Subunit: 330 residues, 4 copies
């Protein structure tokens, strides 16, 4: 947010780590399109409704969250700050926001989960199905509340910034959960049968995939082109959200991510029908600023912007915000 | 207008007062969108009609106005010139244009109204309903002809220019009517029952709110996103105007504001169905130029541009201009 | 064309005469929109048709023309070259292109018509109906073949370039036909009854005005916003052309002008249904280059570009070009 | 690709040869539009499908190709490298990609075909029908597998770069097949009756021409505006592809070219329904880099980008990629 935040991160981080963070695949057409898609959306606000008890809280996966928002899974957070995932998870817990532990976290998932709060666990499918399901079991044993199964990474997209930078994981950053293979619908079934936790498919863009996700027993989906980091030229999730929300017809939670940069963007996502958004890169920008406090400031400012936007739009509740109409600009 | 006017104001005013005037909320997406929306509108002019008696006059709220236009409520006009509201109101009266006295005027509403002309009074709802209705009574006792109830400010939008400027009301600028709380439909009813003056709801953007405004007994609405100063990402009024005009079906006056910068823009608004426009920032630019004469020059030039545009479009009357067709460009 | 032409005119002409030529009214929104509208049009070419006898000729108002094009009426052509209208008319005659003599020509209409060729006469309605009809009679007596009645100038649009330039007709440039008032449909009838020449209404933009023009006995219309020089914000003629062509259903010739800068633009206009185009400013650019030869070079190059474009589009005739389909871009 | 490639060619080639290569006709509106049209296309990827045997191979004209792609006919390839067509054809053969020998090749078609691989032959119709059909016979005798009949060049478009450059074929570059006239549908029939090879009409943009091509016995069409080099203002092939694919209803192969710059662009073309693309200018950029190796590197990188894009989109086969949905952006 407040560009300075991104800029502040521009300066403190090595250019090639900032590139790892900011970049997309190919020509970054889908990265830029996420922003263009949000900027095209205008909200039609409602006036003169009772705002005496404006609340940004939602119930999701059986638990309350302070905002319609969770921290997106972003790998190797020690790349951005020495406290890495622990800093972010602490601030998320204190802000009442779920935090998604990555399969490729630079601190073990048991440690991040001990922080408390509302930890979710993002799963990459491993070449060994038994390693995959043991990771799922670890996450559940550790008290994670949802498995965020990433389904748009059969393999990683081609990041031209990382290729031009000759960038590689510095020696001091490890994959702490370890001491990969394309997921299919069969993999989704294996996870679903292995856990009672809600399974959330992250990276759904096609309407029929959203429908199939509900048929497959998913508790939610994240409508997402992976921040423009996977298929270059993939439609933005925000452009598919309304259609997907209609097709799912309440059958699972529908989250969206990609380019959420303000409370007004959260409002736009919710007016398009999203249950909640994920926020990725901005949380990592703040992480270069004071973990339990730099991230906490981001979340407080986002929390205030959401509350402001909702009230100006006449929405006492997130549910009311989902019933707002929108109009697409140019 | 004539940019020089804005520029002329650029130089004479402190940078932080010009920012108070020119800015919007958030990223100023709705501020810029008001202009983009007008620029997209093209008029289909009619030819060869009798123009022998081209008149820009309208009847609104029982009285004639010289142009389909009123001065928008803009608070603390002494911020822009030492004569402040008195300068503007005098020029408006002389131009035959209604002038909207602000709740937050830097000269008392009784004084501005003594200037004569066609004063309207803009109301902010106060935390105390009895203070609100006493303000309404004052305005009516003072001869104001309409209550412009601002309904899109449950609280003020977040103005990043003002936050970055650390801007605050200079010591010499006071709220002369005094020596706030979210309005609801119940507040609208309280005002309507308290006065025989037409009540005009300013800040309506949703079609169903426009319909409800007529149901609630409003004499008019102003289709408006508050000059991009309230919800950032709120649709421009100009983009909702045609739909709202159709839904109201003549049930109240439908004004529009936001980015009106010329007589051609007035024509566009009227061709989209508006009864009249409000003009805000341009009147304040002129106010740095000679009150009873700088504002008067703006209004004369606007008056001439409206007359020119109407005749070139084949419209002998504002009513004829409302029957013009339009085509949206890119 | 070949920008150099415009640039070449940029240098030779006084800045304030080039401004008189190049400018539009208001913010020049309609001036720029004429170009944006043509650039949005894409032609769907046809392949493999017989091109053995590609011809750019058309019949219009009973006579053959070499190209689907005439020189637009542009006043005071001695502003641009000492031979003024005589230079242009000679080159037009030699190119087989009709030439529109202006009411405000800087050489008498009898003299221009003596040049020969296919002279049309553009009429401004004069405050005195008898002066108007005597001008029509002069034109007819002089052998003009069509009266181009300009119907979009009840008065002249506000040209901000001319106002900022304080520009005025130099002393050596006269209105040679003399030694004005809004036209109405009654004026059109007066002209139609006064002459057997086809009457062509120039400046029609509304579909119902095009229909009424046919009802009124017009032999043609020019779909035109006057080169963006009259109502600022008037739709481009090119954007109304297809609709107008359909509504007229062959009932009169439908010309278009505004921003025609190449043979490809001529093809686009004809594919949208135009009978012919008018070309204005480019002819005057060339006029700063050698009358009977600078204009003649423009017309030869335009003639070649039209022939090229038509053949590449698979059109042996202008009629075939009118049956081409188009697709609008962004 | 990797701009450097184009830039690398920017430096090594004479400015006027690079212009011959890069330029289009007229204002290059159709050249630029080919790129804008691809950039507007977004793919809706599918998730969680079996990718165990992702293959980019297709069958076309009875033979397998490694990728849904062939080298476009580009004349006088010795303009770009001393080995010219032989370098490109060798790399194409090694990459399993068809190579289109030009009528105006700077090495004889018998020699290029001796290289082996999958040579196609592009035909310009000659003023002498017997010369045309003897060229067709030569190509067939030499083992070419398809006649690519160019149908959008009754004559060459007007290339303003070449006219401004006064550019002409250097003395050392010859038309090796020799030691022209507009084609019609009758010419197409003459070719079809003269050969058992599939006849592929290159330069089809109109739906009815695509239909007629199938009626005429074509084995394929290339939906193409000739890289923006023929009619300036011709619609991009990519913008007509979906409509043409639907109208042909499997009746012939439908190729597309124009602005294909990546594997993602190949995916977009195939998702719009194309059987295969042609790639022109990029192959010639690489040709300034090492024939049997510079072109080979381009084709390997394109091959990898296609495979990547297909898998990220959930497509195990090119056929699956054709069933992807797309969404048009702005
Ligand atoms: C920037 C970044 C993103 C990801 C990662 C790393 C980096 C450095 N790693 O790959 C994750 C992972 O490990 N698992 C996964 O599912 N998604 C990942 N993502 C992307 C994901 O969470 C997005 O949905 C998010 O970026 C939304 O957009 P934003 O708010 O605009 O940033
Ligand atoms: C610029 C400015 C505007 C307002 C204010 C102050 C400033 C410095 N204060 O907040 C008022 C108020 O006190 N009450 C209210 O109803 N509206 C207000 N407005 C806005 C309002 O009148 C708009 O509708 C107008 O700006 C149209 O757009 P414009 O012509 O483009 O300028
Ligand atoms: C530039 C210019 C134009 C005119 C004039 C003067 C100047 C200096 N005088 O006013 C005429 C007149 O005397 N009568 C009339 O009917 N139209 C006139 N026009 C405009 C008219 O002919 C247009 O339709 C044309 O400009 C098309 O556009 P273009 O090809 O882009 O230039
Ligand atoms: C650049 C260039 C192109 C052609 C030529 C020369 C040059 C220097 N000569 O004229 C050919 C020919 O001899 N025969 C023919 O059918 N097409 C030709 N083309 C064009 C053709 O193959 C296009 O379809 C292609 O450019 C796709 O676009 P791209 O990938 O963006 O480049
Ligand atoms: O491709 C991406 O942006 C990613 O998701 C990360 O690199 C990752 O997950 O490893
Ligand atoms: O937010 C705004 O632009 C305003 O309306 C003024 O600041 C106000 O009314 O006080
Ligand atoms: O307004 C215009 O551009 C004109 O038509 C000329 O100035 C004119 O006709 O006098
Ligand atoms: O016009 C073009 O780009 C071409 O096709 C080549 O110049 C050619 O074929 O000779």
């Amino acid at each position: 947010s407040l560009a300075d935040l991104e800029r502040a991160a521009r300066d403190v981080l090595p250019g090639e780590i900032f590139d790892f963070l900011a970049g997309g695949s190919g020509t970054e057409a889908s990265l830029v399109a996420n922003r263009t898609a949000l900027e095209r959306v205008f909200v039609i606000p409602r006036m003169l409704r009772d705002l005496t008890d404006v609340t940004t809280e939602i119930d999701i996966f059986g638990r309350r969250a302070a905002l319609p928002m969770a921290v997106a899974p972003v790998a190797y957070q020690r790349l951005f700050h020495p406290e890495g995932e622990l800093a972010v998870a602490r601030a998320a817990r204190d802000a009442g926001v779920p935090y998604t532990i990555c399969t490729l976290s630079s601190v073990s998932l048991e440690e991040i989960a001990a922080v408390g709060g509302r930890p979710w666990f993002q799963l990459f499918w491993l070449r060994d199905e038994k390693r995959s399901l043991d990771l799922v079991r670890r996450a559940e044993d550790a008290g994670c509340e949802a498995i965020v199964f990433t389904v748009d990474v059969p393999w990683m997209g081609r990041r031209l910034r990382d290729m031009r930078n000759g960038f590689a994981l510095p020696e001091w950053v490890t994959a702490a959960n370890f001491d990969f293979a394309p997921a299919t619908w069969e993999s989704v079934e294996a996870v679903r049968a292995h856990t009672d936790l809600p399974v959330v498919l992250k990276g759904i863009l096609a309407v029929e995939d959203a429908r199939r996700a509900v048929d497959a027993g998913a508790g939610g989906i994240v409508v997402s082109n992976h921040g423009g980091r996977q298929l270059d030229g993939a439609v933005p999730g925000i452009e598919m959200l309304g259609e997907i929300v209609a097709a799912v017809s309440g059958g699972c939670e529908v989250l969206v991510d990609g380019g959420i940069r303000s409370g007004g963007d959260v409002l736009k996502a919710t007016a398009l029908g999203a249950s909640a958004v994920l926020v990725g890169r901005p949380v990592m920008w703040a992480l270069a600023a004071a973990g339990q406090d730099g991230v906490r400031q981001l979340l407080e400012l986002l929390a205030e912007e959401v509350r402001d936007a909702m009230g100006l739009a006449g929405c006492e509740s997130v549910g009311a915000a989902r019933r707002l109409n929108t109009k697409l600009g140019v």
